[PDB]
Amino acid sequence: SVSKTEHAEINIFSVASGHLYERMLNIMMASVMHHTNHTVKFWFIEQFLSPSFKDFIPHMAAEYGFKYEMVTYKWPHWLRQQKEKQREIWGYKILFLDVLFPLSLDKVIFVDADQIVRTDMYDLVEHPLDGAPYGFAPMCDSRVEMEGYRFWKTGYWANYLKGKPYHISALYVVDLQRFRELAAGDRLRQQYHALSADPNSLANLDQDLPNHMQFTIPIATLPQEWLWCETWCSDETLKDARTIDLCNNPMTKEPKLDRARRQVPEWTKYDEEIAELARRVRE
Ligand SMILES: *[C@@H]1O[C@H](CO)[C@@H](O[C@@H]2O[C@H](CO)[C@@H](O[C@@H]3O[C@H](CO)[C@@H](O)[C@H](O)[C@@H]3O)[C@H](O)[C@H]2NC(C)=O)[C@H](O)[C@H]1NC(C)=O
Ligand SMILES: O=c1ccn([C@@H]2O[C@H](COP(=O)(O)OP(=O)(O)O[C@H]3O[C@H](CO)[C@@H](O)[C@H](O)[C@H]3O)[C@@H](O)[C@H]2O)c(=O)[nH]1
Ligand SMILES: Oc1ccc(CN2CCOCC2)c2cccnc12
Ligand SMILES: [Ca+2]
């Protein structure tokens, strides 16, 4: 149990760029802590964060009882860069899983900055991966009225997948030991570097890459309840949702904070609690 003592029982990493995504990142962290008594450590992709966020994180850590660490990893010069900040951030989620964390960490979970956690994240740590270096929840099929927007159900993806699930990259558990054993980081970087020579390829960089590689870098398909997003998932399955992603709805184009307040009743509770912690530190 070197990993649990040197780090924590639950290790979550996330990426956030912008005050809005940093405001949601604090909410995500509070939601994790309200649903677990296991030790938690949050790991942040440091260079995207504002100076205010990095100043506030020790206050969140002391109030909620978690450890944290800033990871500053530099994009290798050989590896095809991303001009768009959104795509650069996606690259940080999926391309460096073997080099961002210390070798003494055996497991890490990516949880999106805009997520609301309603479960003990140690259940994901304990989830059997059957030898897969990582596990992702599938994209919901349950909201039948959104079938026209499920690009992965027809065209190039339906032919490529051969019936395999097209997984959502909002949440994923990485068994770092197995990822290292399989050199999945080196292989993901190489396939990304070859694929990205075509600027039309990997439209959803962080999502398309592990879905493309799932025949050779296995994905343990997580239970559907691990990731619920209103765009693709039915209202009836929300009560089972372990975590919620505020994923974009191509039909309604509803703003981010509106989706948060409308779908998640405890969202303002976390937002106000974190704002109350900020006014308590300020005075
Ligand atoms: C984190 O740890 C706390 C403290 O152990 C957990 O709270 C405890 O949860 C149990 C299970 O619900 C409670 O026991 C039961 O409580 C009900 C309601 O009073 C009572 O009718 C039953 O007879 C039984 O005693 C326990 O009271 C409660 N303790 C406190 C201080 O709230 C909490 O559930 C843990 N959270 C996680 C995510 O593990
Ligand atoms: O830190 C961030 C993240 C996103 N955005 C912007 O927000 C917009 C929409 O992105 P986002 O809110 O991330 O969309 P989601 O639908 O929530 O993203 C889903 O789909 C992405 C891949 O397409 C995955 O990376 C996510 O985990 C998954 O939730 C874009 O302009 C992003 O550049 C930011 O400004 N800052
Ligand atoms: O490795 C791949 C990369 C990109 C795409 C297409 N993208 C552009 C439109 O949105 C979906 C993702 C693929 C489609 C099918 C199979 N493999 C793919
Ligand atoms: Ca999201």
Author numbering: 1191 to 1473
Task: Kindly provide excerpts from the paper associated with this entry.
In the course of an X-ray crystallography FBLD effort aimed at the discovery of molecules binding the catalytic domain of Chaetomium thermophilum UGGT (CtUGGT GT24), we encountered crystal polymorphism: the majority of CtUGGT GT24  crystals belonged to space group H3, but some crystals lowered their symmetry to an equivalent P1 pseudo-rhombohedral lattice. The best hit was a CtUGGT GT24  2.2 Å  H3 crystal soaked in 5M-8OH-Q. The molecule is bound to a conserved patch on the surface of the protein. Diffraction data from this crystal process in H3 with Rmeas H3 = 0.323 and in P1 with Rmeas P1 = 0.206. The CCP4-Dimple/REFMAC5 Rfrees are Rfree H3 = 0.227 and Rfree P1 = 0.2537. The compound binds to a conserved patch on the surface of the CtUGGT GT24  domain, about 15 Å  away from the UDP–Glc binding site. The morpholine ring is partially disordered in the crystal, but one of its ring placements is 4.2 Å  from the conserved 1396DQD1398 motif coordinating the Glc ring of UDP–Glc; the ligand also causes a displacement of the side chain of CtUGGT GT24  1346Y. Through this displacement, the 8OH-quinoline ring inserts and is sandwiched between the aromatic side chains of the conserved residues 1346YW1347—which we propose to call the “YW clamp. The two aromatic side chains stabilise the quinoline ring, forming an aromatic trimer; the 8-OH group of the quinoline also establishes an H-bond to the side chain of 1402H. The compound is now the starting point for a medicinal chemistry programme that will develop more potent and selective UGGT inhibitors.
